Structure 1
Amino acid sequence: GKVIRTLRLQKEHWKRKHHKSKGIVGFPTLKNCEATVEKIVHESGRPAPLAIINYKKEEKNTKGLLVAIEGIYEGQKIQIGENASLELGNVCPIKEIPEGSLVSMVEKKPKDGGKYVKSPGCYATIVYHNKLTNQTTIKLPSGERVRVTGESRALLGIIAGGGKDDKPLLKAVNAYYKYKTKGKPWPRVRGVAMNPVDHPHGGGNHQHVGHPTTVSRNAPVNGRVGLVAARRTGRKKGSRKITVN
């Protein structure tokens, strides 16, 4: 047969375009700074708003981008790095923040610029500090617990734009605007409605799959469709998670 939809959309001419982008998002590199928030802006592909910051490096003014936490305003002064106060919207070394606190834009290793929590409405929880090894345990929004060194930086607050998934998209055109900038195929034609030249689920005198939909992790790429390496299937209840800090 021919090449399936899933492979074609991974070729280079289909990658997302950057022409409307504001810049690369991430923290400054300097040990200490005082910054001012210049503007709060929407960026074409992203639902969380961005804040433009201004800080001096040598004598010269320089500009950066952060993801906005909820409760900043244009004109606010913010303090970055060691010796910053625990005030909403400051950036601090993680070892300085008390247990049970909520944080965003956490660095996985020092000076990486911030990864981890970046989507609207999300946060992470500080669950443990180890005074020997200088590690800290953070609980991520998937439920995963990960350990990071005390020298990493983090932003104090919750990411702006929460609640967005409460309102249903009642019409086809509303879905169109949401997926127009994403990589997923919309509208999505079902594999059982294709001919066998186009998809492993195609063909036959009734619309059916005909073979089990759970497939191996090591299966060849042009036929790896369906539920890939599923441990279980169906709507029944699972089992207890195992937890360590």
Structure 2
Amino acid sequence: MGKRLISQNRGRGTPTYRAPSHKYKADLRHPRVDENSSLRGEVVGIEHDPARSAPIAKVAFENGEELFLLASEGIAVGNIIECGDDAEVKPGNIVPIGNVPEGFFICNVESKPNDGGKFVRSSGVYATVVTHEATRTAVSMPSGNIKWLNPKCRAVVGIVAGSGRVDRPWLKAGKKYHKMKTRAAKYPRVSAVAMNPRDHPFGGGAWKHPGKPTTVSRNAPPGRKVGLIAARRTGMKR
């Protein structure tokens, strides 16, 4: 058994690959709202989220529950966040995407209604509402894909705060090191061609090279799915 790969080590769940969950502020999700209900809350603070490197808003709701929300750009302390099917479609409000006009920017979008918000959550990203239909509503993802969602899926109106985070180059291994201390990701990473053959499919050889094509089949088993996985194509576009 030429040793297991880094991906298999991470799947094992060892401490080297686990997130420092105790360092994080909140499991960001929409407040739980019953069918045909609404809740209002006011923003009391804007805090740094170590798990995302983007601000989060602390919201005190009418029901006596205090919750951390994924902050949209422009959300300010003292703002009244409304969440409901009848809520005004305004930045920071959590409304169903069936009530959002075409061309509006949404974020923290539920995969299914009441899911808590799955898509469009990183700093600066946003989704655009494209079409409305009777049972489906379509949005353009930050990836460019068109996603057909239930119109009852809730989303906060606006874009995610923290835009331009990666415009500043790391410039230095130490800065990225400090970012990686709060993440599960292993830093730094050794290239596979630099490893021995017992440690990677690409390892070994008198000189550094994979020895086999780096595009691997989608059928390849664990310990073998390395390099370009099921690549449609390779190279820079001609």
Alignment TM-score, normalising by the size of structure 1? 0.87
State the Cα distance separating 1:137 from its structure 2 match: 0.9
Give the whole-Å Cα distance in 1 for the aligned partners of 2:128 and 2:143: 12
Q: Counterpart of 2:39 in structure 1: which amino acid?
A: C
Aligned counterpart for 1:20 among listed residues 11, 20, 23:
23
Q: Is the 8 A contact 1:92 1:153 kept in 2?
A: yes
3-state DSSP of counterpart to 2:20? coil
Q: Is the 8 A contact 1:42 1:50 kept in 2?
A: yes
Q: Give the conservation status (yes or no) of the 8 Å contact 1:20–1:43.
A: no
Q: Report the counterpart of residue 205 of structure 2 in structure 1.
A: 204
1: CA distance between counterparts of 2:146 and 2:222?
Answer: 32
Matched with 2:85 is: 82
Q: What SS does structure 2 have at the residue aligned with 1:223?
A: coil
| Paired amino acid for 1:36 | E
Secondary structure of 1:29's counterpart equals: coil
Answer with 1-10 or 215-224: which moved more: 1-10
Aligned residue type for 1:56 = E
Decide which of 51, 60, 82 is 1:54's aligned counterpart.
60
Q: CA separation in 2, counterparts of 1:84 and 1:173?
A: 45
1:129 and 1:33 map into 2 onto residues whose CA distance is 25
What percentage of aligned pairs have identical amino acids?
Answer: 43
> CA–CA distance in 1 between the matches of 2:152 and 2:7?
41
Specify the alignment match of 2:101 in structure 1.
98
**Match runs of 1:177-196 below 5 Å:** 177-196=178-197
> Matched residue pairs, number?
232
CA RMSD of aligned residues (A): 1.7
Give the aligned residue type for 2:143.
S
Distance 1:226 1:29, change over 3 A: same
| Bigger radius of gyration among the two | 1
One-letter amino acid matched to 1:201: F
Query: Per-residue deviation at 1:160?
Result: 0.7
Q: Residue 39 of structure 1 aligns with which residue?
A: 45
Query: What are the ranges of 5 or more consecutive residues in structure 1 without an aligned counterpart?
Result: 238-245
Aligned runs of 1:1-245 on 2, under 5 Å?
1-13=2-14, 14-30=17-33, 31-57=37-63, 61-130=64-133, 133-237=134-238
One-letter code aligned to 1:127: V
